[PDB]
């Protein structure tokens, strides 16, 4: 059972701008996704300070980066708070309508795409490098769901029958053919060191056979 939804017009416009604007500094997508993971880990940590059972679904608070050259995917995994089905549908837990409005006003006023995270819509920078994004998520208060979009104005949500996650979010980037540098260990290490050096959770870069 797959449900297909239309993006709000403003979010579709944000995604088309990200896909179509000439902008060479694409590597910032990874900083934005890691920042979102850190924010989600902060939320479950805060909840656990008054209710330790919030971590019954997993005590470890971490971020994993998993490149797969055979599938041409880069996956960002975190054990943060996750997202309910309602959160997924409501722009992955963001205020993306008002954030897009502010972002595009900033762009016409001199800003560049790298400042997207200051407007709460950094997730959509994934489309700088990915032709399709799949988001698998599990929140303590809901079941495990898969969101997916290749842009083009629509996204899908379905219950996920894949590997149970316990709690957290996996962002699977199906990379564009010309963006495979983001599967190379030395390139990922460079970006993490440049942009994510002060993230307060362990970031483990997995290696491949
Ligand atoms: C937009 C978004 C996507 C994934 C996560 C996460 N890693 O929980 C958080 C946000 C705000």
User: Which of 15, 63, 76, 83 gets mutated to test ligand 1 (max ligand atoms within 8 A of its CB)?
Assistant: 83
| In contact, 87 and 139? CB cutoff 8 Å | yes
**What ranges in the chain are assigned the alpha helix state H?**
9-20, 28-48, 85-89, 96-108, 185-195
Q: Please count the other Cβ atoms lying within 10 Å of the Cβ belonging to residue 144.
A: 19
CA 10 vs CA 61, 76, 83, 98, 130: distances in Å? 34, 26, 22, 9, 20
The method recorded for this entry reads X-ray
Rounded CA-CA distance 140/54 in Å is 7
Rounded CA-CA distance 51/29 in Å is 33
Give the contacts of 208 (CB within 8 A, at least 6 positions apart).
67, 68, 69
What is the DSSP-derived secondary structure letter of residue 207? -
Q: Binding site annotation covers 36? A: yes
Burial of 38 (0-12, 13-18, 19+ CB in 10 A): buried
Helix 9-20 and helix 96-108: axis angle, to 10°? 40
| In contact, 41 and 201? CB cutoff 8 Å | yes
| In contact, 190 and 31? CB cutoff 8 Å | no
Q: Binding site annotation covers 97? A: yes
**What ranges in 72-198 are assigned the alpha helix state H?**
85-89, 96-108, 185-195
Q: Which residue has the tokens 């489309």?
A: 127
Q: Please count the other Cβ atoms lying within 10 Å of the Cβ belonging to residue 49.
A: 8
| Distance linking the first and last C-alpha atoms of the chain | 35
Indicate which atom in ligand 1 lies nearest the CA of residue 92.
1
Indicate which atom in ligand 1 lies nearest the CA of residue 36.
9
Which two tokens mark 86?
């309602």
Indicate which atom in ligand 1 lies nearest the CA of residue 123.
1
Rounded CA-CA distance 94/69 in Å is 31
Report the topology of domain 2-205.
Answer: Heat Shock Protein 90 (3.30.565)
């Amino acid at each position: 059972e797959v449900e297909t939804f239309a993006f709000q017009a403003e979010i579709a416009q944000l995604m088309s701008l990200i896909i179509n604007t000439f902008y060479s500094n694409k590597e910032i997508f990874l900083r934005e996704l890691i920042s979102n993971s850190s924010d989600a880990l902060d939320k479950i940590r805060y909840e656990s300070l008054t209710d330790p059972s919030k971590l019954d679904s997993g005590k470890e608070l971490h971020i994993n980066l998993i490149p797969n050259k055979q599938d041409r995917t880069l996956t960002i995994v975190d054990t943060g708070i996750g997202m309910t089905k309602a959160d997924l549908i409501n722009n992955l837990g963001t205020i993306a309508k008002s954030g897009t409005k502010a972002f595009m006003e900033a762009l016409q006023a001199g800003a560049d795409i790298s400042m997207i995270g200051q407007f709460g819509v950094g997730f959509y920078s994934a489309y700088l490098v990915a032709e399709k994004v799949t988001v698998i998520t599990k929140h303590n208060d809901d079941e495990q769901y898969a969101w997916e979009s290749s842009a083009g104005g629509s996204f899908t949500v379905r219950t996920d029958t894949g590997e149970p996650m316990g709690r957290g979010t996996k962002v699977i980037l199906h990379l564009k053919e010309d963006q495979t540098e983001y599967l190379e260990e030395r390139r990922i290490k460079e970006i993490v060191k440049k942009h994510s050096q002060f993230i307060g959770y362990p970031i483990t870069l997995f290696v491949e056979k």
